[PDB]
Amino acid sequence: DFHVSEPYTLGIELEMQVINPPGYDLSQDSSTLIDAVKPQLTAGEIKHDITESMLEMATGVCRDIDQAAAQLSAMQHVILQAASEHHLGICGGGTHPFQKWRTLENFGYLIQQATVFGQHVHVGCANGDDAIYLLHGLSHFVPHFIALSAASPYMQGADTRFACARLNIFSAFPDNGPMPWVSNWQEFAGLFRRLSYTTMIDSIKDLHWDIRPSPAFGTVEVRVMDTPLTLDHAINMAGLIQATAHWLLTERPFKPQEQDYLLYKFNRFQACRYGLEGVLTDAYTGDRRRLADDTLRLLDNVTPSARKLGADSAIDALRLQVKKGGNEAQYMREFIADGGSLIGLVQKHCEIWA
Amino acid sequence: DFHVSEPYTLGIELEMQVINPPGYDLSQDSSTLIDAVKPQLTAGEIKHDITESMLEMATGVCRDIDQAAAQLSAMQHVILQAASEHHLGICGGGTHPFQKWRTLENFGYLIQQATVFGQHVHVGCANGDDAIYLLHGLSHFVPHFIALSAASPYMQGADTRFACARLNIFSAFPDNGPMPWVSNWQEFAGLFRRLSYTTMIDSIKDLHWDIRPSPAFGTVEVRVMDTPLTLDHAINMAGLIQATAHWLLTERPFKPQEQDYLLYKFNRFQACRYGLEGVLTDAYTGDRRRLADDTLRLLDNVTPSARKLGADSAIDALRLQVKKGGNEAQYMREFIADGGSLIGLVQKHCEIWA
Ligand SMILES: [Mg+2]
Ligand SMILES: [Mg+2]
């Protein structure tokens, strides 16, 4: 079932907040911005989501982060243009810091909390058995990815004490968290066949896993990241995932087993609550490594791969971020301790995107 | 180790709501009520929890639903008198229809939520391999237990659209849901040794699974039901659960396997969202049976077990419930569609408890 990709190919989706410049709440009509924009587009796709306070931008299939980065700018330039003209703003962030409130029948008040904004990264694979191996490998660094990209400390007017609270709002859905264990593509096809016997699942797109394979695009999509405040930070996470994927498939450093996932949810929570401060627990021995120490280990491990792919810039910047500093949620909170308001925080994010 | 128990013994825990009679919000001062009641007990305990809007009442080790009924009647006569003379009222339901509000370091805004009320039922086992087997059998019927006992359609003044919304507020904890697979008691001690390598867990009380073996008490505890509106419905559920444990251990319907749990979370969502109207899906054949229909199968199957244990009155009352309508949450909505107010709802609920 698996479309064949040039291995290590890259694709980025970004879910973008649309703002309203007086009071800076979430906009009501982004289908007027999106319809203004499409005409003037050269590279990429801009898509309509459901609540009309979101603007998805996506690259095409990219051969490295330079191509990705410049497709992102070609969309940004056009977006920021038509935004001025409709007196609107655009920013990232995993949540909007203060906005309050047929898929409605199925899920009720679960889809009536914060509307929520993520970055997805696609990586190309040769055959699909590789895709499953890669998925398992990338699942070991889901905490790392989350903590490098956390950008959602504020929900519904208040500090949640989480670096990433965005992911919490998906947790009562039956399909949340890690993909159930399969060992190869034959078994994955078996899993999807059985899951789809339910009323709730008709397609691959209906399964909101942390990491899921796309048969159609020939990829593995990692979906845990909050939409970041800036294009550089998005590109840096894309490079890390590309580079990590290359390390895994090339050097094959793991022999993945079902018992690896045992503490998946405990480690994933640690990265959401705290950040790079979160504590990782090994399933088998119980040895615990601080998240920050362990992402330095990861950035070291994937440096050779990043050089071959043209993504050394990205893991150079991430190493800076970890060694002295933190995620974009940490810095949102320093802004507030300087007597800033939440109305002014969102405004500074609209500007920072540029 | 697994304390040896007389097979099919019964424990009932009931978390009750303590109410403030003018405006019918939850009271904050329910431990002065408890301390008036403790001395006058001839059988069973009463406790406080972290907020003092809850009153835990637990039977001791009982031998049938008649012994359980008797102690719960005896505790209740004494609490109805201690609350009457003390300006407070008592009711059930898994959620308060409109209440708003050290460990808030660990979980933040997640425990700063609606405080929720549940009924737990322990069933005793001889060896601790029978517990693992019993747990896997009851897991098949979690959807049914929830659908039958659902009593939490309103949160924060609004209709969630769910039968049981109480179970959603736990979904963000990494340990929510089903216990990860083990095939026997030796494997279960391995599982627990590994889960406890984390900061977040030291004892068994810390793991908030739907069904959970208690080695100390020598039981399997099912933990998914909302506190019902009356003691009779509480007892009928205990009766069904004990009859079901007997049928399972005695006739061994199932050869349990990890792949049996594939659709577990999809099926329990259906029970939470819809009533007995939820549809249950078989992991192997993809067969869809409506939940009201499958609860009648479960009722017929455990009829011989229930008769033997003196709980045949409970499965007679539940067959009635399944045939002529549905759960307490449904009848909560009918009171509001009739012209009722949410304050009147809680007041009616204090009256039904007597
Ligand atoms: Mg995507
Ligand atoms: Mg309990």
Tab-separated table of C-alpha atoms in Angstrom, chain B:
chain	number	residue	atom	x	y	z
B	1	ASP	CA	1.970	-10.836	48.080
B	2	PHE	CA	-1.629	-11.683	47.089
B	3	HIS	CA	-3.647	-12.168	50.309
B	4	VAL	CA	-5.846	-15.264	50.045
B	5	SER	CA	-9.539	-14.332	49.958
B	6	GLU	CA	-12.813	-16.182	50.173
B	7	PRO	CA	-13.885	-16.258	46.487
B	8	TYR	CA	-16.654	-13.804	45.478
B	9	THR	CA	-16.462	-11.613	48.575
B	10	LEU	CA	-17.553	-8.033	47.952
B	11	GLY	CA	-16.376	-4.517	48.756
B	12	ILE	CA	-18.192	-1.299	47.865
B	13	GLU	CA	-16.705	2.195	47.930
B	14	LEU	CA	-19.038	5.168	47.300
B	15	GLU	CA	-17.822	8.739	46.875
B	16	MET	CA	-20.749	10.981	47.796
B	17	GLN	CA	-21.288	14.688	47.100
B	18	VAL	CA	-21.679	17.024	50.115
B	19	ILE	CA	-24.027	19.927	49.379
B	20	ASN	CA	-24.749	23.438	50.759
B	21	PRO	CA	-28.596	23.604	51.031
B	22	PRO	CA	-29.413	27.274	50.119
B	23	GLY	CA	-27.786	27.438	46.687
B	24	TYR	CA	-26.827	23.738	46.393
B	25	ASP	CA	-23.181	24.202	45.365
B	26	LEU	CA	-20.644	21.751	46.823
B	27	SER	CA	-19.745	22.434	50.451
B	28	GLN	CA	-16.069	22.891	51.394
B	29	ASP	CA	-16.622	21.752	55.027
B	30	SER	CA	-17.465	18.018	55.020
B	31	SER	CA	-14.918	16.738	57.553
B	32	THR	CA	-16.819	18.162	60.527
B	33	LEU	CA	-19.687	16.033	59.227
B	34	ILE	CA	-17.457	12.934	59.113
B	35	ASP	CA	-16.150	13.444	62.633
B	36	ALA	CA	-19.717	13.574	63.977
B	37	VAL	CA	-20.496	10.208	62.275
B	38	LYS	CA	-17.444	7.936	62.803
B	39	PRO	CA	-18.134	6.839	66.426
B	40	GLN	CA	-21.707	5.592	65.829
B	41	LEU	CA	-20.682	2.905	63.318
B	42	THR	CA	-21.204	-0.818	63.930
B	43	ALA	CA	-19.946	-1.890	60.470
B	44	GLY	CA	-17.790	-0.029	57.819
B	45	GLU	CA	-15.707	3.202	57.491
B	46	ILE	CA	-16.184	6.840	56.376
B	47	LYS	CA	-13.330	9.071	55.190
B	48	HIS	CA	-12.503	12.545	53.847
B	49	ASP	CA	-10.568	13.140	50.611
B	50	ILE	CA	-8.399	16.160	49.529
B	51	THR	CA	-11.258	18.595	48.997
B	52	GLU	CA	-13.917	18.373	51.655
B	53	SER	CA	-16.868	18.276	49.286
B	54	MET	CA	-16.697	14.470	49.230
B	55	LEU	CA	-17.736	11.757	51.670
B	56	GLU	CA	-16.199	8.303	51.058
B	57	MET	CA	-18.274	5.482	52.490
B	58	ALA	CA	-17.031	1.917	52.270
B	59	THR	CA	-18.460	-1.413	53.337
B	60	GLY	CA	-16.099	-3.926	54.921
B	61	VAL	CA	-15.583	-7.393	53.474
B	62	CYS	CA	-19.120	-8.658	52.751
B	63	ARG	CA	-20.389	-12.031	51.463
B	64	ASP	CA	-23.457	-11.088	49.382
B	65	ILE	CA	-25.477	-8.024	48.247
B	66	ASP	CA	-27.789	-8.407	51.264
B	67	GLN	CA	-24.898	-7.954	53.711
B	68	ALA	CA	-23.639	-5.041	51.587
B	69	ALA	CA	-27.129	-3.464	51.435
B	70	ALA	CA	-27.455	-3.717	55.240
B	71	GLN	CA	-24.195	-1.898	56.083
B	72	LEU	CA	-24.911	0.805	53.468
B	73	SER	CA	-28.397	1.301	54.966
B	74	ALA	CA	-26.803	1.538	58.437
B	75	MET	CA	-24.125	4.056	57.416
B	76	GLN	CA	-26.804	6.076	55.576
B	77	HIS	CA	-29.308	6.379	58.450
B	78	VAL	CA	-26.459	7.878	60.506
B	79	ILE	CA	-25.215	10.336	57.797
B	80	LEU	CA	-28.741	11.541	56.942
B	81	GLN	CA	-29.122	12.466	60.635
B	82	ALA	CA	-25.669	14.062	61.012
B	83	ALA	CA	-26.287	16.219	57.924
B	84	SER	CA	-29.882	17.138	58.737
B	85	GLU	CA	-28.959	18.650	62.101
B	86	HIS	CA	-25.857	20.230	60.550
B	87	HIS	CA	-27.251	22.251	57.662
B	88	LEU	CA	-26.059	20.025	54.743
B	89	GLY	CA	-27.435	17.534	52.227
B	90	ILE	CA	-26.122	14.441	50.452
B	91	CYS	CA	-26.435	13.151	46.884
B	92	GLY	CA	-24.854	11.023	44.166
B	93	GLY	CA	-23.980	11.526	40.505
B	94	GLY	CA	-20.483	11.411	39.018
B	95	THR	CA	-20.241	15.128	38.595
B	96	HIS	CA	-21.805	18.245	40.123
B	97	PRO	CA	-24.014	19.872	37.446
B	98	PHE	CA	-22.580	23.389	37.891
B	99	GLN	CA	-19.795	23.593	40.504
B	100	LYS	CA	-16.781	25.637	39.440
B	101	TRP	CA	-13.413	26.250	41.075
B	102	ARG	CA	2.145	20.147	46.691
B	103	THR	CA	0.463	17.972	44.035
B	104	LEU	CA	-0.628	20.968	41.890
B	105	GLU	CA	3.066	21.195	41.097
B	106	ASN	CA	2.938	17.796	39.400
B	107	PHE	CA	-0.368	18.151	37.500
B	108	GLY	CA	-1.184	21.874	37.515
B	109	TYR	CA	-4.579	22.943	36.142
B	110	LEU	CA	-5.459	19.233	35.645
B	111	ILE	CA	-6.400	18.634	39.307
B	112	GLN	CA	-7.758	22.208	39.536
B	113	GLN	CA	-10.892	20.865	37.845
B	114	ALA	CA	-14.356	19.645	38.686
B	115	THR	CA	-14.022	17.261	41.633
B	116	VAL	CA	-15.608	13.935	40.626
B	117	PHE	CA	-17.459	11.117	42.377
B	118	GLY	CA	-17.171	7.371	41.707
B	119	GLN	CA	-18.330	3.950	42.912
B	120	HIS	CA	-15.649	1.251	43.186
B	121	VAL	CA	-16.329	-2.490	43.622
B	122	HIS	CA	-13.774	-5.026	44.917
B	123	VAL	CA	-14.194	-8.752	44.184
B	124	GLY	CA	-12.120	-11.307	46.113
B	125	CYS	CA	-9.936	-14.013	44.586
B	126	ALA	CA	-8.155	-17.090	45.971
B	127	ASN	CA	-4.875	-16.954	44.082
B	128	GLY	CA	-3.490	-13.909	42.275
B	129	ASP	CA	-3.507	-15.559	38.837
B	130	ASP	CA	-7.297	-15.729	39.062
B	131	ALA	CA	-7.164	-11.960	39.599
B	132	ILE	CA	-5.352	-11.352	36.309
B	133	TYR	CA	-7.831	-13.651	34.547
B	134	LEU	CA	-10.788	-12.017	36.284
B	135	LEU	CA	-9.478	-8.576	35.348
B	136	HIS	CA	-9.268	-9.504	31.673
B	137	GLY	CA	-12.835	-10.825	31.739
B	138	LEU	CA	-14.299	-7.745	33.398
B	139	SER	CA	-12.386	-5.560	30.905
B	140	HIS	CA	-14.668	-7.045	28.206
B	141	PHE	CA	-17.587	-5.495	30.133
B	142	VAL	CA	-16.277	-2.068	31.122
B	143	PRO	CA	-18.365	-0.449	28.344
B	144	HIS	CA	-21.464	-2.109	29.799
B	145	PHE	CA	-20.671	-1.136	33.418
B	146	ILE	CA	-20.241	2.533	32.383
B	147	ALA	CA	-23.340	2.641	30.210
B	148	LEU	CA	-25.471	1.159	33.014
B	149	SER	CA	-24.126	3.475	35.712
B	150	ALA	CA	-23.552	6.697	33.740
B	151	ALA	CA	-24.559	9.714	35.797
B	152	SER	CA	-22.615	12.790	34.699
B	153	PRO	CA	-24.031	14.615	31.655
B	154	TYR	CA	-23.552	18.156	33.074
B	155	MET	CA	-20.310	19.923	33.922
B	156	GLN	CA	-19.916	23.620	34.772
B	157	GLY	CA	-23.544	24.497	33.998
B	158	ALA	CA	-23.507	22.898	30.552
B	159	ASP	CA	-24.591	19.763	28.725
B	160	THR	CA	-21.416	17.895	27.698
B	161	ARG	CA	-23.516	15.714	25.372
B	162	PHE	CA	-21.977	12.659	27.126
B	163	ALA	CA	-23.695	10.064	29.307
B	164	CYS	CA	-20.521	9.835	31.412
B	165	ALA	CA	-18.256	12.909	31.275
B	166	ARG	CA	-16.659	12.115	34.634
B	167	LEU	CA	-14.136	9.671	33.103
B	168	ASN	CA	-12.749	12.332	30.710
B	169	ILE	CA	-11.185	14.497	33.387
B	170	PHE	CA	-8.672	11.725	34.145
B	171	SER	CA	-7.557	11.135	30.549
B	172	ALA	CA	-4.446	13.345	30.766
B	173	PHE	CA	-2.713	11.258	33.447
B	174	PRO	CA	-0.270	8.811	31.804
B	175	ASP	CA	-1.824	5.927	33.812
B	176	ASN	CA	-5.490	6.459	32.812
B	177	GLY	CA	-7.313	3.656	31.041
B	178	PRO	CA	-6.602	-0.066	30.913
B	179	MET	CA	-3.728	-1.750	32.717
B	180	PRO	CA	-1.014	-2.629	30.181
B	181	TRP	CA	-1.074	-6.317	29.218
B	182	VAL	CA	0.229	-9.154	31.366
B	183	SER	CA	-0.785	-12.853	31.089
B	184	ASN	CA	-0.280	-13.822	34.779
B	185	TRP	CA	0.714	-12.648	38.303
B	186	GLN	CA	4.488	-13.157	37.891
B	187	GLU	CA	4.397	-10.813	34.874
B	188	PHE	CA	2.254	-8.362	36.887
B	189	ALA	CA	4.971	-7.923	39.513
B	190	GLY	CA	7.448	-7.255	36.694
B	191	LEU	CA	5.091	-4.657	35.209
B	192	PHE	CA	4.770	-2.896	38.604
B	193	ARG	CA	8.509	-2.974	39.388
B	194	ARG	CA	9.039	-1.165	36.058
B	195	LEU	CA	6.233	1.371	36.388
B	196	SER	CA	7.607	2.286	39.826
B	197	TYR	CA	11.033	3.229	38.421
B	198	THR	CA	9.227	6.546	37.749
B	199	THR	CA	8.937	9.503	40.140
B	200	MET	CA	5.193	9.579	39.600
B	201	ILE	CA	4.542	6.084	41.084
B	202	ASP	CA	5.570	4.259	44.315
B	203	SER	CA	2.516	2.181	45.298
B	204	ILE	CA	-0.541	0.539	43.659
B	205	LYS	CA	-2.858	3.309	44.932
B	206	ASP	CA	-1.052	5.588	42.427
B	207	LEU	CA	-2.090	3.693	39.281
B	208	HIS	CA	-5.526	4.893	38.171
B	209	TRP	CA	-6.557	1.998	35.910
B	210	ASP	CA	-10.139	1.084	35.068
B	211	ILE	CA	-9.630	-2.254	36.777
B	212	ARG	CA	-6.834	-2.835	39.269
B	213	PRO	CA	-5.728	-5.789	41.398
B	214	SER	CA	-5.336	-5.074	45.103
B	215	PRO	CA	-2.776	-7.551	46.570
B	216	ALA	CA	-3.285	-6.274	50.150
B	217	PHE	CA	-7.080	-6.751	50.174
B	218	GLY	CA	-6.786	-9.779	47.848
B	219	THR	CA	-9.207	-8.410	45.230
B	220	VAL	CA	-9.800	-7.112	41.727
B	221	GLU	CA	-11.260	-3.578	41.907
B	222	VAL	CA	-13.377	-2.197	39.077
B	223	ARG	CA	-13.199	1.590	39.224
B	224	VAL	CA	-15.092	3.033	36.259
B	225	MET	CA	-18.647	3.718	37.469
B	226	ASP	CA	-20.163	7.008	38.480
B	227	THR	CA	-21.559	7.250	41.966
B	228	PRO	CA	-25.262	6.528	41.436
B	229	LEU	CA	-28.175	8.573	42.730
B	230	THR	CA	-29.440	5.841	45.018
B	231	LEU	CA	-28.035	3.026	47.195
B	232	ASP	CA	-30.193	0.461	45.345
B	233	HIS	CA	-28.524	1.158	41.958
B	234	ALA	CA	-25.138	1.054	43.675
B	235	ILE	CA	-25.961	-2.393	44.982
B	236	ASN	CA	-27.335	-3.699	41.679
B	237	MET	CA	-24.038	-2.873	40.020
B	238	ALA	CA	-22.078	-4.609	42.757
B	239	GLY	CA	-24.374	-7.586	42.239
B	240	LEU	CA	-23.771	-7.686	38.507
B	241	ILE	CA	-20.049	-7.310	39.011
B	242	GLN	CA	-19.867	-10.207	41.523
B	243	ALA	CA	-22.111	-12.427	39.417
B	244	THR	CA	-19.897	-11.647	36.415
B	245	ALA	CA	-16.734	-12.532	38.344
B	246	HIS	CA	-18.270	-15.866	39.300
B	247	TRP	CA	-19.371	-16.710	35.767
B	248	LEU	CA	-15.897	-15.851	34.467
B	249	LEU	CA	-13.805	-17.823	36.967
B	250	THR	CA	-16.285	-20.706	37.009
B	251	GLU	CA	-17.065	-21.198	33.253
B	252	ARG	CA	-13.867	-19.583	31.728
B	253	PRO	CA	-15.537	-18.079	28.587
B	254	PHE	CA	-12.401	-16.483	27.342
B	255	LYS	CA	-8.794	-17.318	26.601
B	256	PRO	CA	-7.549	-13.735	27.132
B	257	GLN	CA	-4.915	-12.236	24.796
B	258	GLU	CA	-3.382	-8.758	24.259
B	259	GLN	CA	-5.091	-8.423	20.841
B	260	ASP	CA	-8.461	-8.565	22.709
B	261	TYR	CA	-7.809	-5.011	24.020
B	262	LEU	CA	-7.213	-3.481	20.529
B	263	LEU	CA	-10.583	-1.674	20.460
B	264	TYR	CA	-10.922	-1.213	24.236
B	265	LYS	CA	-10.684	2.597	24.230
B	266	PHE	CA	-13.037	2.928	21.249
B	267	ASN	CA	-15.660	0.825	22.965
B	268	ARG	CA	-15.452	2.648	26.304
B	269	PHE	CA	-15.709	5.990	24.515
B	270	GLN	CA	-18.939	4.777	22.912
B	271	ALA	CA	-20.349	3.947	26.366
B	272	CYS	CA	-19.282	7.323	27.775
B	273	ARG	CA	-20.646	9.344	24.877
B	274	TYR	CA	-23.798	7.389	24.012
B	275	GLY	CA	-25.937	5.405	26.379
B	276	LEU	CA	-26.608	1.819	26.038
B	277	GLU	CA	-26.988	3.435	22.560
B	278	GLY	CA	-23.228	3.128	22.021
B	279	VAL	CA	-22.130	0.457	19.565
B	280	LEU	CA	-19.538	-2.148	20.498
B	281	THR	CA	-17.043	-3.516	17.933
B	282	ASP	CA	-15.371	-6.923	17.971
B	283	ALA	CA	-11.613	-6.772	17.509
B	284	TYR	CA	-11.461	-9.938	15.302
B	285	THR	CA	-14.632	-10.152	13.128
B	286	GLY	CA	-15.595	-6.457	13.008
B	287	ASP	CA	-19.133	-7.265	14.168
B	288	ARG	CA	-21.191	-4.383	15.528
B	289	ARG	CA	-23.641	-5.049	18.350
B	290	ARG	CA	-25.604	-2.278	20.048
B	291	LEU	CA	-24.710	-1.947	23.755
B	292	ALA	CA	-28.252	-2.401	25.113
B	293	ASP	CA	-28.499	-5.662	23.160
B	294	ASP	CA	-25.128	-6.974	24.419
B	295	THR	CA	-25.923	-6.107	28.034
B	296	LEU	CA	-28.970	-8.411	27.773
B	297	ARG	CA	-26.586	-11.201	26.653
B	298	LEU	CA	-24.389	-10.473	29.655
B	299	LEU	CA	-27.442	-10.466	31.904
B	300	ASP	CA	-28.649	-13.913	30.645
B	301	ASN	CA	-25.123	-15.393	30.871
B	302	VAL	CA	-24.578	-14.510	34.514
B	303	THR	CA	-28.142	-15.334	35.598
B	304	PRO	CA	-27.131	-18.805	36.908
B	305	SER	CA	-24.119	-17.240	38.706
B	306	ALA	CA	-26.253	-14.495	40.264
B	307	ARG	CA	-28.867	-16.951	41.566
B	308	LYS	CA	-26.167	-19.022	43.308
B	309	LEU	CA	-24.824	-15.904	45.134
B	310	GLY	CA	-28.145	-14.278	46.112
B	311	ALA	CA	-27.784	-11.393	43.677
B	312	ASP	CA	-30.604	-12.371	41.320
B	313	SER	CA	-32.642	-9.340	42.454
B	314	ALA	CA	-29.918	-7.074	40.997
B	315	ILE	CA	-29.883	-8.596	37.529
B	316	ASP	CA	-33.716	-8.480	37.505
B	317	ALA	CA	-33.659	-4.710	38.192
B	318	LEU	CA	-30.999	-4.095	35.532
B	319	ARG	CA	-32.798	-6.165	32.862
B	320	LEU	CA	-35.739	-3.834	33.508
B	321	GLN	CA	-33.470	-0.795	33.096
B	322	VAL	CA	-32.029	-2.077	29.804
B	323	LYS	CA	-35.414	-3.057	28.349
B	324	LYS	CA	-37.402	0.002	29.473
B	325	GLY	CA	-35.027	2.888	28.698
B	326	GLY	CA	-31.609	3.693	30.211
B	327	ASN	CA	-29.315	5.287	32.827
B	328	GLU	CA	-29.577	8.026	35.478
B	329	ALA	CA	-27.871	10.546	33.132
B	330	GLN	CA	-30.688	10.130	30.630
B	331	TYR	CA	-33.242	10.858	33.375
B	332	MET	CA	-31.220	13.890	34.408
B	333	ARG	CA	-31.691	15.333	30.890
B	334	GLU	CA	-35.427	14.551	30.971
B	335	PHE	CA	-35.813	16.585	34.183
B	336	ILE	CA	-34.213	19.590	32.427
B	337	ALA	CA	-36.215	19.116	29.191
B	338	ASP	CA	-39.289	19.058	31.452
B	339	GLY	CA	-38.683	22.578	32.736
B	340	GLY	CA	-36.222	21.896	35.538
B	341	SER	CA	-33.242	23.987	36.580
B	342	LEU	CA	-29.774	22.687	37.486
B	343	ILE	CA	-30.239	23.810	41.139
B	344	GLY	CA	-33.517	21.887	41.225
B	345	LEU	CA	-31.666	18.903	39.747
B	346	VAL	CA	-29.291	18.666	42.683
B	347	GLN	CA	-32.109	19.213	45.152
B	348	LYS	CA	-34.144	16.397	43.633
B	349	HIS	CA	-31.016	14.278	43.863
B	350	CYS	CA	-30.686	14.868	47.642
B	351	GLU	CA	-34.328	13.791	48.058
B	352	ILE	CA	-33.920	10.599	45.981
B	353	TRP	CA	-31.151	9.635	48.419
B	354	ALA	CA	-33.685	8.633	51.169
